[PDB]
Amino acid sequence: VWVVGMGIVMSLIVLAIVFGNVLVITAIAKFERLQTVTNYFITSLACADLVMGLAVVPFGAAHILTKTWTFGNFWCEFWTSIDVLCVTASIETLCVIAVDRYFAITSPFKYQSLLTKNKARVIILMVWIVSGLTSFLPIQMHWYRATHQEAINCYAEETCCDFFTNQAYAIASSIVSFYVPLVIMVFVYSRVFQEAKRQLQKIDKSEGRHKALKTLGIIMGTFTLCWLPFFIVNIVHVIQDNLIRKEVYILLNWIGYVNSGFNPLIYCRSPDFRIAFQELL
Ligand SMILES: CN[C@@H]1CCc2c(ccc(O)c2O)[C@H]1O
Numbered sequence: 476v477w478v479v480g481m482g483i484v485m486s487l488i489v490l491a492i493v494f495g496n497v498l499v500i501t502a503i504a505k506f507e508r509l510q511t512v513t514n515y516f517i518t519s520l521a522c523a524d525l526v527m528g529l530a531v532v533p534f535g536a537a538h539i540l541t542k543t544w545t546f547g548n549f550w551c552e553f554w555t556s557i558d559v560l561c562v563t564a565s566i567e568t569l570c571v572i573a574v575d576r577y578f579a580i581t582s583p584f585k586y587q588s589l590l591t592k593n594k595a596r597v598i599i600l601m602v603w604i605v606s607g608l609t610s611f612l613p614i615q616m617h618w619y620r621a622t623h624q625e626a627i628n629c630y631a632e633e634t635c636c637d638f639f640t641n642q643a644y645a646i647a648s649s650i651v652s653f654y655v656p657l658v659i660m661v662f663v664y665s666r667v668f669q670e671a672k673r674q675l676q677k678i679d680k681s682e683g684r685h686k687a688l689k690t691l692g693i694i695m696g697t698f699t700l701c702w703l704p705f706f707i708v709n710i711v712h713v714i715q716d717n718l719i720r721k722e723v724y725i726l727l728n729w730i731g732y733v734n735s736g737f738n739p740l741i742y743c744r745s746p747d748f749r750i751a752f753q754e755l756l
Contacts, residue, residue, distance in 0.1 A: 478540060485536045488736065489528060495739040496525035502743075502751045509751060513575055515595040517742065519603070520568040524735035527561040530554075532732065539725075544636040551636045552614050560610035563652045565735060567602045569698065570656035572742075577663035580670055609651055619644040637721070645713040653706040660698075664691060697741055701734035 499521045503509050534554055538544060544551070579586050613619055619640050620630065626639040671687045705727045712718050 482536070482540060485532070488733065489532050489536075492528035492532070492736045493525065495736060496521050496528060498752070498755065499739045499743060500525065502748065502755065506751050506754070508747060512590050512592060512595055513579075515599060516568055516572050516575070519599050520565060520572070520738060520742075523561055523564040523568065524738060526557075527565070527732070527735050530557050531561060535729070538636070543634050545634075546636075548633045555638065556610045556614045559614070559648065559652075560606055563606040563609065564603060565738075566652055566656050566702070567606060569738075570659050571598065571602060573656075573660045573663050577667055580667050609648060613644060640713065642713055645709060649706045649710055653702065657699075660695070664695065667691075693741065697737055698734065701737075702731055705731045 500518065503514060503518050503521075531554075575590060578589050582589075621639050621641050623639075626637070629635040629637060629639065668687060668691060675685065708719060708724060708727055712724065
């Protein structure tokens with residue numbers, strides 16, 4: 476009396492994510508005015524979110540709704556690697572989108588030298604290859620297996636499929652994928668806010684007859700609320716045993732996946748993007 480209802484909501488999530496991603500990608504592709512050296516990162520983020528929505532959510536929904544995996548043992552390592560790759564790529568793309576804006580605000584005269592047409596391609600290939608180095612390599616070669624008697628059968632059994640990681644690969648992946656982008660964002664956005672406050676003070680002193688707080692607050696809060704608890708609990712259950720159950724872990728993992736849907740709404744707000752979206756329909 477409850478399986479039917481949840482499926483509708485999860486399918487709506489899938490539809491919203493895919494619709495937003497496709498709309499952003501086609502808006503960037505069709506119109507020449509939107510092409511900019513700082514818009515390639517948006518394209519990469521949209522592609523990563525679309526890959527997440529197309530190859531991550533449906534399999535998880537099928538696994539959750541149905542009793543058993545009902546697929547081969549080979550596909551589980553592919554699915555987990557795809558999830559890890561997509562999450563890491565999204566996080567690092569967000570970090571780059573923060574870094575280039577910090578460079579633009581801090582030093583405007585030399586902003587042209589730092590970012591060029593070829594630089595975006597190089598940085599995107601580098602960031603994606605770093606994301607893929609930690610996804611396929613340590614999973615496809617079975618470097619993350621655990622020594623516990625529990626889940627040894629799960630590795631052996633083709634029907635069972637759930638995440639069980641060693642002590643290293645959990646903390647190492649968390650450090651690589653979450654904490655460094657968070658620190659970089661915090662520092663650069665604090666500096667940007669300081670510069671904006673100084674400029675506002677100067678103009679208010681010049682003209683003898685806020686607003687950035689809302690933007691910075693939403694930008695930081697969406698990401699933090701979406702991705703903070705999952706990595707904390709990921710660290711803790713490996714640090715100590717019997718700390719959590721599995722249902723809470725799965726629920727936090729699923730609620731972390733909704734971030735990719737909100738990013739197109741959060742990021743594209745310029746009048747040019749609105750005019751383009753109007754021109755689509
Ligand atoms: C079960 N899904 C995976 C499992 C572990 C993991 C995820 C995301 C980023 C990481 O760095 C991870 O180690 C999750 O999306």
